[PDB]
Structures are given as C-alpha cells and as structure tokens.
C-alpha cells in the first residue's frame, strides 16, 4: 500500500488500494458479530438487473 505520492494531485488516486484494504468490513465487525445474514442479502443485483 506504500506509494510515492507527489505534490500536484493532492487528493485520492488510491481507489484500487483503498478498495483492496476496505476498512468498512473491519469497522462493521468492530460493532456486533453475526457469522450469518449477508448470504441472504446478496444474489439480488444480478437477478434484478437482467432484461
């Protein structure tokens, strides 16, 4: 995740690595633990976005 960022850009341009790290999942597990539920929530975008 170590990159040699320079002056002009000043913002972001690390979307791929930020998505790879994905602190959201650790933030969510920080509060409550489930082990089961996300399986039901998925398989809906692919099923719906077809025509």
């Amino acid at each position: 995740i170590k990159v040699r960022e320079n002056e002009p850009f000043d913002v972001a341009l690390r979307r791929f690595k930020r998505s790879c790290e994905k602190a959201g999942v650790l933030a969510e597990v920080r509060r409550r633990e489930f082990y089961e539920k996300p399986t039901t929530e998925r398989k809906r975008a692919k099923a719906s976005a077809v025509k």
Binding site: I1, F16, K17, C20
Partner: protein, 55 residues
C-alpha cells in the same frame, strides 16, 4: 497451464499488491485459476512474491 515456474507470466495475473485477481476481470476458466491460485500461494510461501507489497 499446469506449470508454476512462470512467475513472470504469473505476475500478469496478480495485482500490483499481488492480490488475487478474480476471473471476472481476466475471464480465465475456473479450473485454470484454481491451479494458478495454488501456485501463487506456494510462491508466496517461498517469498518470491510477498504476502502484500508493503512488506
């Protein structure tokens, strides 16, 4: 194919971090990526490519 000694060729299928690229992007057959992932993990054990690129 069944080989594992093409780390240069293998490097194309890893991220800059070396992370495991799903076939959704590459489009390879599942059988192939299975052996590819095995080879990648074994190479990681041999420290040819790191666990992650920040090491």
């Amino acid at each position: 194919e069944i080989d594992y000694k093409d780390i240069a060729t293998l490097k194309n299928y890893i991220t800059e971090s070396g992370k495991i690229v799903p076939s959704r992007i590459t489009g390879t057959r599942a059988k192939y990526q299975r052996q590819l992932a095995r080879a990648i993990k074994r190479a990681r054990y041999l420290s040819l490519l790191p666990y992650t690129d920040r090491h």
